[PDB]
Amino acid sequence: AREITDIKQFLELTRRADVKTATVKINKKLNKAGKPFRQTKFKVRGSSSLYTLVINDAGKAKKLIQSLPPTLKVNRL
Amino acid sequence: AKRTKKVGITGKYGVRYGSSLRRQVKKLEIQQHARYDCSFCGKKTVKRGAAGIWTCSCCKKTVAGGAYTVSTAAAATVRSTIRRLREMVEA
Amino acid sequence: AQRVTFRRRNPYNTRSNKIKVVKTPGGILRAQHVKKLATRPKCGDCGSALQGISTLRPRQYATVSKTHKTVSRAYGGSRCANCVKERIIRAFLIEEQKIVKKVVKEQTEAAK
Amino acid sequence: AAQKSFRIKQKMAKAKKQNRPLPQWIRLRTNNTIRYNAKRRNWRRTKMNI
Amino acid sequence: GRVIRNQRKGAGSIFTSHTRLRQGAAKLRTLDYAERHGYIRGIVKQIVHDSGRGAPLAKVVFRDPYKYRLREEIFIANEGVHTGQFIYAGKKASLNVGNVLPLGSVPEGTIVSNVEEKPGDRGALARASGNYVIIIGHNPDENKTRVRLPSGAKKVISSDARGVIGVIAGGGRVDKPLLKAGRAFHKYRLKRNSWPKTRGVAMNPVDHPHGGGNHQHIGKASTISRGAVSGQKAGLIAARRTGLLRGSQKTQ
């Protein structure tokens, strides 16, 4: 039910006690006028609401994904 | 562009009821709908709504009054002789 | 062309049975039931909607942060600020002109 | 009548159950004297008066 | 024969008051220590239409002298009284429109409303839009006060009978032609089921003492004895005269 955009705050969810699941989504999408780019949403499933974090830039997106806690159970796509 | 020769507001009633009852009704209607001066802020904004209740558009004071007019002959003559009698008991 | 149906068993157009037509992700039209509209709380002194205060149906007010239920100044979300000014001034003056009445009838009781 | 009381649903229930033909083995009993179900009932022939 | 109509009305069936909307019942304050050793201030906080009534009521709230809180009364609004006005009620209260004073404490000629037949009956006399009583003198031993009621009648009551100074609001109400059936319809809609009225003379004999005959007519004198029995009194009961009142009335 929620959108997040502080990448720092975000990571703190993924390591928040009750967070068992998390899912990455990938969207083909177009940029401004011409070409397209590859948008990715990070959805952490909280006990009470689903936080999701858009990261347009793939460059950020890549690194971000390793950061994902190695006990968190991620559904890829 | 003088719209009706003589039936004024009472022209809604058409031909019904007979001239004389309309004549009577017209008098008190003209009375009851019309806007009056406020004895409190001075703005002619007192209008009616249910017999005997007169309220002020702005300033919102509400006075009790006549069934179709703000002050009634009788009441005011009473107001005056209440003055009178009260004057006797400080003088 | 697409028509629609009530969603509750009640078949009549009562206040508590308002409908709203709405387009779903399925691509169809579905009824929806619309709760009565809330109304604004009112000043005790004068009677106008008092600003700063959120307008919910009465029980919904207990599901909402206290700041939604007041403004700061005294008689917060209860009288309309202008109307508080009224009763501050009046309070002052009458407490004052109360002193005046006192030393004056003390003067009456003094010399007479 | 489409949104019923339990008491009424139940009479209702019980009455579904009594709606059967004679169980044909009764016929074989010694002295058995019942031929058909004489108290059978149909929804559009006889109303239950609740 | 049938039970006629005026008999039926008494068992209150379709015949009782239509009262869902009424504002409460108007009466004066209880005759407590304040109001009867001094005076006690209230404010008229709003004056308001009472349903099926002619005159407006005025909600008038007071302090409770005995425990901390407010108690509110419902008054019949005299003419001229207005929201925000202060109201003074007591023996030692003063003589202005809207206050309420024992008929003992007001000079002859004073004009009051909602006056008590007995002290603290919280008001009985003159309440209808427009009406009022006038004090026409008082004999100060056995402290009576004589008044003239709106009927013309002259009663003497206790001097401690309370009354409120002025005349009841909404006067003139009856001056205006009802005009159509409907207006009267809606009028009784908020009173009782008394309208419309079938003439007995148009009923059959089962129905009325006026019923039947091959032309419509009363058939015998329609002035009926006081001593008549239920079923007999329809017409001019106990009529001590009858016919077009020639000449000026006005009680001598």
Place this chain on the structure above:
Amino acid sequence: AHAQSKREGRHSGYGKRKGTREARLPSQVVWIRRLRVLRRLLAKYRDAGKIDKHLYHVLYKES
């Protein structure tokens, strides 16, 4: 096709008319149309200065 021929002003004659001129398009609607436009022509000229505020105000109650 027809709707075109309409908006090219056709089949709009006294013999293709069945509701009163009034019903087809209300007298009042016209008034509000017209009057709102005068009222707002006025406003721009004032809020600009082509008209002076006094001249405006006469034209207002004049319109």
Place this chain on the structure above:
RNA sequence: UUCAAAUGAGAACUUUGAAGACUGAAGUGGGGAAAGGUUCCACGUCAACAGCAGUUGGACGUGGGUUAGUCGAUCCUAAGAGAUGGGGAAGCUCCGUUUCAAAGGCCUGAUUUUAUGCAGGCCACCAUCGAAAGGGAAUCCGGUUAAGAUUCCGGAACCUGGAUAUGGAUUCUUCACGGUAACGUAACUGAAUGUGGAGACGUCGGCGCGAGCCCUGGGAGGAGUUAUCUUUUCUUCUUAACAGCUUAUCACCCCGGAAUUGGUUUAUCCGGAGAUGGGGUCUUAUGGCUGGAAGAGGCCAGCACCUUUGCUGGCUCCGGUGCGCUUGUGACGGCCCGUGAAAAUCCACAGGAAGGAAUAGUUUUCAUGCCAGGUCGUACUGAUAACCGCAGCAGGUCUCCAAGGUGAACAGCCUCUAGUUGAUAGAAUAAUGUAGAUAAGGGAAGUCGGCAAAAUAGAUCCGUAACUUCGGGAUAAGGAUUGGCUCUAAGGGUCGGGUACGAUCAACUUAGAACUGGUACGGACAAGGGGAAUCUGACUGUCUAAUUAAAACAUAGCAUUGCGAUGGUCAGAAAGUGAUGUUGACGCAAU
């Protein structure tokens, strides 16, 4: 209504395909209330039943089927109903509902023999039943079944109660800062008692805005027509609760001090009790963008195979218009001798009892965290066959949703979606009929009587008598005109212009002019006959369900009567009983 097939011993009547029609969104469409009670659905199946038939059925036989913290009930109060101390009554029972009554229960402290005796203050509120349309804590989308779904599945929420810790906030100036102010905020102790709000409320009118619908351009797909013509005709292009940010007519605040009065609505209201102006504050209906959410749904293409049935790709985009239609809402205005419920329940404020830190306290109206949500209803019909009328009766029976054209239009007539194509059948077409029509010349001569029937009819323009309560009579009467097609003129929005105009975008209305036809044109549908008088009731309204709708009843208006409560009139067997009466003569009662 029709052709064929299929099934079957048997087919006008069942199933499937085709064809011809109908209902025409005020439905023969899609759901419900009452009532029914299994009629729902599957399989089997024709002795009765379905006034021909029958292989079919609401029939028979046999089974299956109705899943909820959020939908209702359940709670609350309405008119009313009705226990209780009492009072009547031989008694069955009648009266009273806070009434003449010693009417009862909460907060916590005191217990540290223990669990609740007493230590304060309160509160004197006075049963209970009564709404599946009134009030009311909280749920949505997708999917799925032979038959259930806001109830299951998937996903995403929210409410109420209970527990509670972690983070934040707060405090050495203890119980927050900021803004001139309106007011701001993630929080920001608050008992008794008091008070305010919300719940909570008429009706009609135009005006403003939302939603869905309707209309429409481009593009990307699929379908249809193509002798000829059509950059065509048809169709898909969707986005829920909930959540973040944003968004408002109204209202309000600061600056300022107005006659040459200004501002201003379609509708004349507002200003020295401070207008216009400039700047701000607020409600968040509503809308936008984002999260939910493309992963769903929608539309295609490309391979796969008895099979479960898959697999793989795409595309799902950008706009325009308005006295449109339904609804919703707002700021206003009209009307009243009519002024248009209640209670539960929720919040707030006034108050300040109390309790609480620097060696460490206070805080769950801030965030995040754990648990729990019982009982009964849930199937289908809702009617020319699931209800009531002896029945599968042309009757009766409360409601929501509502497309295109013509046209004023929810009219009639035609159509899209959906649904039906049920009503014994065949052959003939005498009399007499019932329903639908036409008739030369005459025109009420018919007849009790113009009964029936015919005539009239829309709109635009012209024209309009007596009489009158001056409002009417009036569409009085009487007239002309009306198609197609081709032009002309008139009526609008959007911008920039130092402190005259030009540029584009989008709408049917009205009037005028040509041409044109077997003089036709409201071309079907739709749609007033008029006039002069007499009798009679003023009018609108009312009644004999099933032979009387009238001149009868009612009504406003007029006039008479009774009554100041220890009362008038009326109720009861009685009464500490009742109606009027939540009343008071501008009233109630009776003519």
Place this chain on the structure above:
RNA sequence: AUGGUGAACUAUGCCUGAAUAGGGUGAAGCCAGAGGAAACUCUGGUGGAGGCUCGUAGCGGUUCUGACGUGCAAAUCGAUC
């Protein structure tokens, strides 16, 4: 005569709900204009009043003294109202 049962129809009151195409008319209030020595009179607009009106649905039930009159129907059906 005695003791009982009925307001599911219908009559009337109360409570709480719901429902009613599209037209004609143009009452108060308001704005601008005209005349007149004066008093005052007049015009064009705006606005949207009524137990008003034309007419659907609705509610009713006038006439055919139509159909039916062992009915579809123990009150129905058609047209007209």
